[PDB]
């Protein structure tokens, strides 16, 4: 009863007929596979099929850094350092080269986009390739392994210290100093938090999506 973030449309004006057709196609596609619900920071294992590889069946494991897109576009990057080499694959849940979407864990890590893992040391990226699933507490609050993440030296690539990103996960005490924190906070915009016009409501849209999903499931 959480609704995948792929159905919720964007604020962009258009014809609801397009969104309805997209939702119908997404439901018809999900009717075949399973596509379980997962959040950011959860380990996943998608078994795709490639035309050239050791066997037509392919496999890969990683953590969902983020997820966006609408309609048939449900992208999600999977991070998994193997053999001491960073690798990232952008998979889409609505592809024809999909067979099984196994979920290993269900976490949130506060931050809704773990894009700073690229700058983090390899310790928080390497994981076992043949790990078993971990399911517990059906229909209950999803656990959140609230833990900080140490960062590499100052040379970064996205300036994660600024407040515009809003991470609340990086351990700035063990990396940044007072002057760095001050220079980062200098670019603060308290008016964005109080801007009640940028919020995109979805109550009625969520209810309509749930009604359509129920109607499609019951017919």
């Amino acid at each position: 009863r959480f609704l995948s973030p792929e159905f919720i449309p964007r604020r962009g004006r258009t014809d609801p007929l397009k969104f309805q057709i997209e939702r119908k196609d997404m439901l018809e596609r999900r009717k075949v596979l399973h596509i379980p619900e997962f959040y950011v920071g959860s380990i996943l294992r998608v078994t795709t099929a490639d035309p050239y590889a050791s066997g037509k069946i392919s496999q890969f494991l990683g953590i969902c850094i983020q997820r966006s897109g609408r309609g048939l576009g449900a992208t999600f990057i999977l991070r998994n350092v193997i053999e001491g080499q960073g690798v990232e694959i952008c998979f889409e849940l609505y592809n024809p080269r999909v067979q099984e979407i196994q979920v290993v864990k269900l976490e949130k890590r506060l931050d809704d986009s773990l894009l700073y893992l690229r700058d983090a040391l390899p310790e928080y990226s390497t994981f076992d390739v043949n790990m078993k699933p971990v399911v517990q507490e059906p229909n209950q609050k999803v656990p959140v392994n609230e833990l900080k993440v140490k960062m590499k030296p100052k040379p970064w690539s996205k300036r994660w210290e600024r407040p515009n990103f809003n991470i609340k996960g990086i351990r700035f005490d063990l990396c940044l100093t007072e002057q760095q924190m001050k220079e980062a906070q200098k670019w603060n915009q308290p008016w964005l938090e109080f801007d009640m016009m940028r919020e995109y409501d979805t109550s009625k849209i969520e209810a309509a999506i749930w009604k359509e999903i129920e109607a499609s499931k019951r017919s």
Binding site: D15, L17, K18, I21, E28, L72
Partner: protein, 300 residues
Amino acid sequence: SGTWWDEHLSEENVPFIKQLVSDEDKAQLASKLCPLKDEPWPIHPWEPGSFRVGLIALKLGMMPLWTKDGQKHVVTLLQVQDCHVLKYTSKGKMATLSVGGKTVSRFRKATSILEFYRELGLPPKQTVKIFNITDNAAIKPGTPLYAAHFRPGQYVDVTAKTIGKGFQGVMKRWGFKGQPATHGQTKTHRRPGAVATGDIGRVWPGTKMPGKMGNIYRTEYGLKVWRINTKHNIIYVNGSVPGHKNCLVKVKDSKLPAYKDLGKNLPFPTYFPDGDEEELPEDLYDENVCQPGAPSITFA
């Protein structure tokens, strides 16, 4: 125009007039929904040299579409709304036919247009694109043209306006490289340097200069159709389409030399729901398109 209608109406006649207008439009549409029942003129078979009438759909949005080979292919959306014929004119260089599209309110229009659209059924439309058709196919005015007119595996051209960027500069209008940022520019970063030569005290007509970009009709040739819908009357064309979202677009048969003699399997005049024709499924698919719900692909 003159004085707008909503000026001398009290707080009780506005909704009544709105409901009356809606009911009249719906009744006219329902009465015109039967083309074959009324005199449809003699229908001729397919010939080597002969074209057919096009459609005027609405560009909703865009969505992807994967083929059986496992490759991404962008596809557009085209909603065929009503789309009726207005009149017919014989010999110009060839026969012509007018077609409409969306249903625009009949209050902000010219008296001549209102009279012309009152002489015929249906309400006044938005645009009126004239198609150069041959003397063979000749459909009577007032007949509908749904999305079933076209079929998959066919190249259909589209033309419409473009997202006008207003009077733009030089780089965005023609792609000029401009000038560097330093070494040693001081006020030259996006301006056009030299015009053309020196002795010539004129300016070559048509020279690239700042102007109004976009906001013009541009046709695209070579666009394959993947899937079509009959319920909502939607047409899914490959590749992008000029014009912003919810914008009327003119669609008709292609014109390339390799795609000219292949309308044998297509309806020469136009699709007729009333039949004596065997209705089509909910949506016709293509031979190289992953159907929605089919099992996962496998290159084994």
